[PDB]
Amino acid sequence: MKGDTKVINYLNKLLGNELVAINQYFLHARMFKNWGLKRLNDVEYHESIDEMKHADRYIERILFLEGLPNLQDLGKLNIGEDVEEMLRSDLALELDGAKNLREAIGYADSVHDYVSRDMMIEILRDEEGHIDFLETELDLIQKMGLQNYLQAQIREEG
Amino acid sequence: MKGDTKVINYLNKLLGNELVAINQYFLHARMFKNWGLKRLNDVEYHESIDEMKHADRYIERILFLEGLPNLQDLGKLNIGEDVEEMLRSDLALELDGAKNLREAIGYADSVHDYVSRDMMIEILRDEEGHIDFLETELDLIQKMGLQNYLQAQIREEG
Amino acid sequence: MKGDTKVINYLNKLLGNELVAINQYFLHARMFKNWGLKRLNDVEYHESIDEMKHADRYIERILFLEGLPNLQDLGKLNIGEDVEEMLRSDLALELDGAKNLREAIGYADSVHDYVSRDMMIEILRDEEGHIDFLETELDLIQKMGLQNYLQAQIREEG
Amino acid sequence: MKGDTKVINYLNKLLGNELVAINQYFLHARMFKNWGLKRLNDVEYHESIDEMKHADRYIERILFLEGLPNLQDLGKLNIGEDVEEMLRSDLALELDGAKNLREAIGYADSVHDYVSRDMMIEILRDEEGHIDFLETELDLIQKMGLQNYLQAQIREEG
Amino acid sequence: MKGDTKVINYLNKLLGNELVAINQYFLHARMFKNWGLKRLNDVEYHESIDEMKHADRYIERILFLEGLPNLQDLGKLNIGEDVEEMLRSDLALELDGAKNLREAIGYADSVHDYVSRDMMIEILRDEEGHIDFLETELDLIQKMGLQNYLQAQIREEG
Amino acid sequence: MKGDTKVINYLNKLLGNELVAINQYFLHARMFKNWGLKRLNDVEYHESIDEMKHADRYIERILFLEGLPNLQDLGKLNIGEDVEEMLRSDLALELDGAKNLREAIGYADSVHDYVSRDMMIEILRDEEGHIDFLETELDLIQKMGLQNYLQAQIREEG
Amino acid sequence: MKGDTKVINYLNKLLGNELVAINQYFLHARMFKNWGLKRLNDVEYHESIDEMKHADRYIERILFLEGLPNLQDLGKLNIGEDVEEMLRSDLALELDGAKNLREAIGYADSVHDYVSRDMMIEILRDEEGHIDFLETELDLIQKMGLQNYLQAQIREEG
């Protein structure tokens, strides 16, 4: 079914955001793993799979609307060298992605692409969950101190 | 069965205490949840359900004694902005409720409403359990320090 | 994540509606229970739990958006003294809450709070179900007469 | 296999009757459902599925005999506004369909289309069951009165 | 263990009340059974067993306290000839027994027979349940009318 | 609950589209079945049930909003005589229905009928799935040729 | 453990190859899915997961050897517009990656990084499997013709 062109560009831009998050979350996960911060590896990994699922949804949707999914262009990763910095970097990235999502959802509505919209509202809801997680971790770091926070990441949560 | 009027007023006043505790405990629970203090959310939540059960018992009793349960008037919530302050506020509230309970139990005895009394002694026993919990948490905060105490709330207790 | 201020006020106002319905439905339930109208106790009780779930969702959302959930202010209960009057009162309350919900959903859309909106559309759908139930019961009362209607509430529905 | 032409016209006319009954029974079912007459929704719904099965049989038979099933022409629905009127309308419709069935069965016999006949005798037997149901309900309405009859439809039959 | 004499007289008087209720409830049950009011037979029967359990408790207690249980004197039965009258008669009897129970509980307290008291408060709680049942049935009779009430007793409650 | 009048007209028009699709899909299914194209019978049949579910949802919604579901008027069926033509006809019909859906969804939003909207967005999502299926089949016919395509429909897909 | 620098550059270059293959295989998979070539979607998807596992292994190894995994630079995707072209493009990519792998394995040996080597020989073995698959499919296309080949991709392999 021939989709609206500008909807497809939004879908590709959103896809672009997910491709960045996939990589940044996966590296972060395995950095934590290497450092033995077992709990942060499990969570960041599971957020990486999340973004993968999101990318898949965009890709299928773009293809269905008869556009060309763009997996070639990869935006800026910002990795960071310590826990706080890296969590903070993931948070900034989610915030920028939520902004793009808000814009695309409004536009899909105005051209009547209600199913693209509905898929996007779902993804936003997942993002908003990732945002909540990061914000919470970052405040815990400050409330309990970095040393206690790190000790609390050594074992996986059952 | 037509109950003693003053017993019904006591039952409504006790109900009023429970309605306050229901709300204060539930908000507290979800504040802790938001902060990621998973363990305090589970406990405060389970104390909220507790007060709900208490309210239900009062409501059924009032109705049985042919009075009018009063769910319209809600006393002062005192929420607080940090863990200690909020736990302390729950403790003051339980202490005031135990006081009212002691008074009502004595009175139900003197007008021979032994089953109202028996229900109330049971509830008091549950309150006394909540009091124990709060007092213990508050002392732990001081003995181990706030930072260690907070770290200890991150995971739920199995 | 810092939410829009006016969205938070709407969320608190909606929360306020749920707190009223929680109490009015619960008292109604136990009044029916006392009268031995077993079936109406089961349904009204299950609608009380429903509103509780709604309140919880608002509370968590407000907290997530970094506002202060307001459980202190409780609007007017209208209890009533016989079945019809009480059902009718629940119906008026749902109708006013649906009105507030419609307004809040429109506003959340225009400030791009699509997830608050999505949660609210879900709640509205549940309300619309409660409305359907009350309207149906009220018509049954008239079609079959009060005496037959009452006899039909004595046993629980399997 | 090339069927007799007039048999195919009969099969299409019978199909036409079923298409009317499908719709009239389904709307009736959901009207009862809306009114909370749970038992009448279950029965009328199950009669709707019944007519659907009948339509399917005609369609397959017409196709097998190499004719063109006609699903385009839809006869007059007569919906009605209250229980009696609607049940009575379903009864008149079944009576007219049984008449057409009797005629078609005789004709299929005389051109030796014994399997079309055999399918039709089966369908007639089901119709005769629907007729029995409607007649019984309509007499119950008069014998026990409308109010008692309505109360008796509120719960589904196990 | 030698009990207080006046406690034993109270226990015998309470026992006397239970012996009356045992018989009155059992006859009532089987009257309802004979009339085909299956539901009232089940409930009144189960209240008869209840009073039997109460009698047993008094008997064991009196014996333990070294007194002589008195099963010889049987107070006035008031049977009645129709449903209302008979239910009303059971209600008056429970009311008189609750009065005696209230008096005995106060006295057991003042002579420090706390376990006799504790057993009696339990029994009172069961009586208060029987009172609730009778009051409810009697109001249902008036609210729905005798004819509808009777029809509602024909089948047992699952 | 009294719905917006124009929403009800949209719901009836959408219902009208579903009634057409129900019949066109069902005949198509049994045509394929007759031709021994087992796989296309299973898929088209399952799309017929799909439209039935959609019709049911509209009917219940219209009734809830207190309008009159219209099952009397049936739009133009376009059946076709060979596989391609028939698939193509189903595709044109879905495309026209999606158009009407897009329009109705926008309007329900502007009069605040958010639950009608939410139901409609769901249905659109199902339609968009049917569209995908038809488009894919039609391209497969061209890519692999009609003879190979037909052979591939002989067995059902596990 | 501080690894050899040039081994880390090889590991990053190999990682780079995997990141390209991940994306190219995933898009290819969902293109096939969209076209209804169910079997090629399953296989290409499962090769995408394969490359992901490979990337993960490189990432963990680089981190262990104390280098910086590079997920920022993405080489040229070559997508293609029809089955042959796309399969052929995957084949050229695997061939270039096998070449880089052969070179890296020899070098790891000469600096005594035997475990990096051992991981790489394993990955090469998987690549060599992908190469086999693509070569076989491409020959099948020629031996049986494109139309027959396409028909053979419609159903998934059990």
Ligand code: HEM
């Ligand atoms: C007003 C703020 C309240 C909130 C936010 C709230 C919330 C909740 C929640 C989330 C549940 C769990 C739902 C479930 O059982 O699956 C629950 C259960 C329950 N609530 Fe409330 N509630 C409130 C007030 C009340 C009031 C006024 C009553 C009346 C007495 C009440 C009585 C109950 C009872 C009896 C249960 C079931 C307990 C159980 O068996 O687990 N609640 N509530």
Ligand code: HEM
């Ligand atoms: C036009 C208004 C119609 C409505 C509202 C409607 C509705 C429904 C519904 C809700 C179901 C149950 C879905 C399920 O099986 O889970 C159903 C089943 C079915 N319908 Fe329809 N339908 C309609 C017309 C038709 C027509 C024209 C046919 C063609 C003969 C048909 C044939 C069938 C068949 C064969 C089943 C499955 C029966 C079974 O095995 O349970 N229906 N319908």
Ligand code: HEM
């Ligand atoms: C580029 C760096 C990537 C890495 C290191 C990576 C890694 C992984 C790993 C280790 C798994 C788990 C394997 C398993 O399921 O057993 C996985 C799963 C998956 N990946 Fe990736 N991946 C990457 C990129 C992508 C991309 C670009 C996509 C395309 C959308 C994608 C889509 C998926 C999907 C759909 C799953 C299965 C999710 C599930 O059902 O559990 N990934 N990935």
Ligand SMILES: [Fe+2]
């Ligand atoms: Fe995402």
Ligand SMILES: [Fe+2]
């Ligand atoms: Fe995210």
Ligand SMILES: [Fe+2]
């Ligand atoms: Fe309490």
Ligand SMILES: [Fe+2]
């Ligand atoms: Fe408490």
Ligand SMILES: [Fe+2]
């Ligand atoms: Fe609600």
Ligand SMILES: [Fe+2]
């Ligand atoms: Fe509600």
Ligand SMILES: [Fe+2]
């Ligand atoms: Fe039929």
Ligand SMILES: [Fe+2]
């Ligand atoms: Fe019929």
Ligand SMILES: [Fe+2]
């Ligand atoms: Fe007793």
Ligand SMILES: [Fe+2]
């Ligand atoms: Fe008793």
Ligand SMILES: [Fe+2]
């Ligand atoms: Fe549909």
Ligand SMILES: [Fe+2]
């Ligand atoms: Fe469709």
Ligand SMILES: [Fe+2]
């Ligand atoms: Fe690989």
